[PDB]
Amino acid sequence: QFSIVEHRLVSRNVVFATGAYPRLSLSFRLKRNIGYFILQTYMPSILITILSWVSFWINYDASAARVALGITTVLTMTTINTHLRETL
Amino acid sequence: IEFATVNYFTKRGYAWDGKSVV
Numbered sequence: 001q002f003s004i005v006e007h008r009l010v011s012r013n014v015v016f017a018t019g020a021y022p023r024l025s026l027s028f029r030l031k032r033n034i035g036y037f038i039l040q041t042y043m044p045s046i047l048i049t050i051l052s053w054v055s056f057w058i059n060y061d062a063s064a065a066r067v068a069l070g071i072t073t074v075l076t077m078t079t080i081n082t083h084l085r086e087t088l
Numbered sequence: 089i090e091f092a093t094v095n096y097f098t099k100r101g102y103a104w105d106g107k108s109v110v
């Protein structure tokens with residue numbers, strides 16, 4: 001899930017009050033890879049938000065269609081959020 | 089989205105009556 005961008009080494013003496021103690025440190029800088037999240041967490045949310053705009057192109061009198069579309073988009077967003085909370 | 093585009097061009101709000109010749 002990560003990619004090691006860089007690794008570093010440092011040697012130093014920690015000046016603790018009683019006396020100085022040696023120390024080495026090996027650091028890694030990880031950078032997270034996002035193709036998972038872009039393809040799976042952002043794409044469906046963007047698509048559902050786009051689908052929610054379809055109601056504006058439907059007539060006002062078509063109450064059942066617009067209501068079903070809007071509330072089912074809300075339900076789909078709820079499902080995505082809850083299950084993504086569970087998985088992540 | 090295809091259905092949305094189809095519905096955008098629908099004129100009459102009533103389907104075929106089943107007893108007419110168009």
Ligand SMILES: CCCCCCCCCCCCCCCC(=O)O
Nearest residue numbers: 050051053054057089092093094096
């Ligand atoms: C951002 C996209 C939102 C979802 C799609 C909404 C458009 C669906 C209806 C199709 C309209 C396009 C045809 C317009 C015809 C015209 O020029 O009058």
